[PDB]
């Protein structure tokens, strides 16, 4: 949404910002920096990542960098800027950006809370679980600027138990967190198939593309190679195919003809024959776009007496079955998939904390609000309520904050 801000230039710093972009670089004119205590900082109506479209009437949407500089520099003291936030995000996450963010102040308050007698976990949780992920990155930088020590290591020494797992998870970037969760699922004498399946089957092309790049920076090896080392059979083939994150992109046209042929091919390769043509299932379910496969699964029910999920339970077993069942759920209704996994992690005796924590951290800024709607509608009470009964202490409070609230 396009909005207007009035800045009064000061002779020191002018507007008090830095800008990047220009049609020379296929970018708009974006606010790079906002200098503390200067003209733009005092309005508190401007954010980094904002695109400057106009300045006192002069358009800037197709302006080069120098054109924008001359325009911003030559404007009078009273400046009217047309500004729009061109940074992408998600409207359905539960954790939003804090409106009084000072990375240095939060860094100091966390340092005092770490060094407070007995460790003040309450303020550590009340800060970190009420900041966005990139705000947590700024806090980590300011903490290392002030203390010359890494915030992650400092919190790893002050915290313990399930709270340490939550907090250390929130500090990592989403790619870093998924990359390290995948590594943790394959490291050791075995493979946490349920964790590897949950991440590989639920991430999008763009999320997987960054995971693959970040995974090699952190571990100097390719994720695909670690997958090949820890898996075998058709399960390896499916995981490697999905982890590539090269699924077709949702186009604007609906291929009704291919929808029917895919539905036939799924039927012919599965419950119509004895045995299963597993490659045919892997090819269709990993390469077609998600909106296409949702229509294929409805067309499948026209040929098959069992739906895609029921057919999987009749056709395959073990880790391959679990993978396909997870994949189809993510294709059909990803928020409901996480609502069900959250339920399973808490419904029974004790808690599957590793699963509960991973979902509450990774989806808090993606679709937690949709997960909560699916959860409440299906199970009758809220995700918040189930977290209350299953967790206690500061650990519970942190998860409640990541949940965002009731219903």
């Amino acid at each position: 949404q396009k909005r207007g801000v009035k800045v009064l230039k000061q002779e020191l710093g002018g507007l008090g910002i830095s800008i990047k972009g220009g049609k020379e670089n296929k970018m708009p004119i974006l606010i790079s920096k906002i200098f503390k205590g200067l003209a733009a900082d005092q309005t508190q109506a401007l954010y980094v990542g904002d695109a400057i479209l106009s300045v006192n009437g002069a358009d800037l949407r197709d302006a080069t960098h120098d054109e924008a500089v001359q325009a911003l520099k030559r404007a009078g003291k009273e400046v009217l800027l047309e500004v729009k936030y061109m940074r992408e995000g998600s409207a359905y996450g539960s954790v939003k950006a804090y409106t009084n963010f000072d990375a240095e102040r939060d860094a100091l308050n966390i340092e005092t809370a770490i060094k407070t007698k007995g460790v003040d976990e309450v303020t550590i949780v009340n800060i970190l679980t009420n900041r966005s992920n990139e705000q947590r990155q700024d806090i980590a930088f300011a903490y290392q600027r002030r203390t010359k020590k890494e915030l992650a290591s400092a919190l790893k020494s002050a915290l313990s138990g399930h709270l340490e797992t939550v907090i250390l998870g929130l500090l990592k970037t989403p790619a870093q967190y998924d990359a390290s969760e995948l590594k943790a699922s394959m490291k050791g004498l075995g493979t946490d198939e349920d964790s590897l399946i949950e991440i590989i089957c639920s991430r999008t092309n763009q999320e997987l593309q960054e995971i693959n790049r970040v995974y090699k920076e952190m571990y100097k090896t390719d994720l695909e190679k670690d997958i090949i080392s820890d898996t075998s059979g058709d399960f390896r083939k499916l995981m490697v195919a999905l982890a590539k994150g090269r699924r077709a992109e949702d186009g604007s046209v609906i291929d009704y003809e291919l929808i029917d042929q895919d539905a036939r091919d799924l039927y012919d390769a599965g419950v119509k024959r004895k045995g299963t043509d597993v490659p045919k299932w892997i090819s269709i379910m990993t390469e077609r776009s998600v909106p296409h496969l949702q229509k294929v699964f409805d067309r499948y029910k026209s040929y098959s007496p069992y739906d895609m999920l029921e057919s999987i339970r009749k056709e395959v077993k073990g880790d391959l079955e679990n993978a396909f069942l997870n994949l189809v759920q993510c294709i059909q209704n990803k928020p409901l998939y996480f609502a069900d996994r959250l339920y399973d992690s808490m419904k029974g005796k004790g808690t599957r904390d590793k699963v509960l924590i991973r979902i509450m951290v990774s989806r808090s800024e993606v679709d937690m609000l949709k997960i909560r709607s699916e959860f409440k509608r299906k199970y009758g009470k809220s995700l918040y309520y189930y977290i209350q009964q299953d967790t206690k202490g500061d650990y519970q409070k942190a998860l409640l904050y990541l949940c965002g609230g009731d219903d």
Partner: peptide, 6 residues
Amino acid sequence: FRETEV
């Protein structure tokens, strides 16, 4: 990386 202060 092109960054100008105004």
